[PDB]
């Protein structure tokens with residue numbers, strides 16, 4: 001699905017050695033710029049074992 005392809009791309013981003021130690025907020029804004037919704041961003045963080053609440057994601061994007 002188009003959604004699953006966005007989430008797959010996001011997971012690979014979040015796993016990268018240069019990305020992983022950087023702050024959550026910068027990762028979230030980057031992923032929104034690539035077309036992800038807040039809910040897709042939330043799914044991607046959980047898929048890399050770094051779960052974030054939707055509340056936190058939405059507050060960053062607000």
Ligand SMILES: Cn1nc(C(=O)NCc2cccc3ccccc23)c2c1CCN(Cc1c[nH]c3ccccc13)C2
Nearest residue numbers: 005006009010012013014016018019022030031034035
């Ligand atoms: C594994 N990886 N994938 C990407 C990347 O941007 N992938 C494409 C992509 C990523 C996420 C969602 C996408 C949705 C649709 C199409 C493409 C998408 C990057 C990386 C490694 C780091 N890239 C440079 C980068 C960009 N922002 C950074 C912040 C801290 C450190 C590095 C970066 C960017």
